[PDB]
Design a protein around this ligand. Structure first.
Ligand SMILES: C[C@@H]1O[C@@H](O[C@H]2[C@H](O[C@H]3[C@H](O)[C@@H](O)[C@@H](O)O[C@@H]3CO)O[C@H](CO)[C@H](O)[C@@H]2O)[C@@H](O)[C@H](O)[C@@H]1O
Ligand SMILES: C[C@@H]1O[C@@H](O[C@H]2[C@H](O[C@H]3[C@H](O)[C@@H](O)[C@@H](O)O[C@@H]3CO)O[C@H](CO)[C@H](O)[C@@H]2O)[C@@H](O)[C@H](O)[C@@H]1O
Lengths: 308, 308
């Protein structure tokens, strides 16, 4: 009679994407046989074990901290990464990359901020990191930023990157980037990623993944702003805190409409931390804004869900 | 025998400021008789009732969404606010301002992003909101942004402000701004704020508030980057979810050091949602990074704490 598992009573709009620091907006299901679904943020087992590059607070996702070195003759800077608490970076943890590192290939725009310790002077500049760059190597402790300055960043001073959104440019077709299911090479071009959370896929006939979807802000061009995570950040936080043991491989959840008292759909929360539904095709779910998920029963992986 | 109250097992560095979307860094106590401590974000009772402008996800704090109108002849734009889910803004809720509105006077810099619905084209520009401006009126649905453009924002299209940090300029003395304990006038200059969470203060002799402190990124000048919240965002989230009834006015917490098994200090978590310690003077707490808070007992308001 183990500690009862549960999911939080939070509506979709009350929750947060686990792959970029923005609120959730909607639920989406579609086929995924054409890509490999292996995000590294928003990965957590139902009994509370964090996976991949997943950490607990949503505001740290896609942030970087460290020291910057100017690439003379350009407006580009190399960041030598620190830990999130500004201590030295320890690359020996058995993780793919620092926790919270971006887990998709794209051009992420935001702001580099810096403080000079001696006098508390500060400065902030637009900056973009291309996580598909050959020199994107956060696991090695190095990432490059393109900025709007060649002079107003000091070396050897604490510097932070705050993400804002994504861009599309450099001749790509509209909405051809970011590529949210393409993992970076965390140690640089032509290196192999390590310690990854596994890829996920529906295995039961008639099932698709259920995605928790947000729209990333766009900062220039015609980017693909869709961003799907496998678990809301709040579910990561909740499972980590509760650490309730899984009694089977699959937790059956019902999505409840409090305005009618009726179930809108049911789904499988797999103990390794992803959700499936019985549907074939691309579908934007139409949900009551006060709807929420409710854990009802531990079932087997071969339970047949009610179609939705 | 009511549902047991508890606080989450999270270290300070695992948690998030509830007044700006940045991680917590440290604990600080100091005297507060010289100012009025009345923040509106990070306000929640121990039995889960949100107060002030407090909402649940840390990434929405100090964000704005809506439509923008260019002030011809300037680089300034008026934002007509929407709800966070992009629905019409409803000013009739009995709250001081939209949930997540900044609750301090200062110059907050970040980025305005916009998407044109017809073709998915996007744009992003540096922007600053002065929450002490006479025309800062989020409760009325209007705030002004200074930007780096007079042409590249369209009217009548969804626009978001993502906060990054704070600036100091315009002739202020170093670290004289932001003023984290000065509430904005949420309906504009010379209007009275409504529906506020109350001011808080130590009342017991020898006690001070305990603050959960972060350093806001600085983007220009010599800003005062200290930002103290009364509750970590995760405690707001946890109390909201657990809604455990308070059995007295004060929850006695012990801060435990897992590396020694010993208590470092104890404190009072008042049921209305703030913490006090027995200390006189300004003190940066030196804590084990894996330390955490643990609820031990409901006590009375006149319990004498062990000095720290
Ligand atoms: C889509 C626009 O993005 C920003 O301008 C960028 C600019 O976009 C141009 C497109 O490349 C092009 O197809 C054409 O139709 O006009 C667009 C500008 O109106 O592309 C350049 C690089 O070529 C830069 O990346 C610009 O930032 C934005 O500022 C515009 O308002 C549009 O949203
Ligand atoms: C402190 C600097 O902030 C940014 O530059 C700002 C500039 O700061 C100047 C101070 O005002 C002044 O006391 C003097 O000592 O030099 C500073 C520049 O080195 O002030 C202007 C307005 O007067 C703008 O706000 C600038 O952004 C930053 O870019 C600098 O690197 C310094 O951190």
């Amino acid at each position: 009679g183990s500690k009862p598992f549960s999911v939080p009573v939070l509506t979709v709009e009350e929750m947060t994407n686990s792959r970029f620091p923005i609120p959730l907006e909607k639920l989406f299901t579609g086929p995924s046989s054409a890509f490999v679904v292996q995000p590294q943020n928003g990965r957590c087992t139902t009994d509370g074990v964090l996976l991949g590059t997943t950490q607990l607070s949503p505001v740290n996702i896609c942030t970087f901290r460290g020291d910057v070195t100017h690439i003379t003759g350009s407006r580009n800077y190399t960041m030598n990464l620190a830990s999130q608490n500004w201590n030295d970076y320890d690359p020996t943890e058995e993780i793919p990359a620092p926790l919270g590192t971006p887990d998709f290939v794209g051009k992420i725009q935001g702001v580099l901020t810096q403080t000079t310790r001696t006098d508390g002077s500060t400065r902030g500049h637009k900056a973009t990191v291309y996580t598909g760059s050959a020199d994107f190597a956060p696991k090695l402790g190095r990432v490059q930023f393109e900025t709007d300055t060649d002079r107003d960043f000091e070396a050897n001073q604490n510097t932070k990157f705050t993400p804002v959104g994504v861009i599309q440019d450099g001749g790509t077709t509209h909405r051809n980037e970011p590529q949210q299911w393409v993992l970076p090479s965390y140690s640089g071009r032509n290196t192999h990623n390590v310690h990854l959370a596994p890829a996920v896929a529906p295995t039961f006939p008639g099932e698709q993944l259920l995605f928790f979807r947000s729209t990333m802000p766009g900062c220039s061009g015609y980017p693909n702003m869709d961003l799907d995570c496998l678990l809301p950040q709040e579910w990561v936080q909740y499972f980590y805190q509760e650490a309730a043991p899984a009694q089977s491989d699959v937790a059956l959840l019902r999505f409840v409409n409090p305005d009618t008292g009726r179930v809108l759909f049911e789904c499988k929360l797999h103990k390794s931390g992803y959700v499936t539904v019985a549907h074939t095709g691309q579908h934007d779910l139409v949900i009551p804004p006060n709807g929420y998920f409710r854990f009802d029963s531990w079932v087997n992986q071969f339970y047949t869900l009610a179609p939705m």
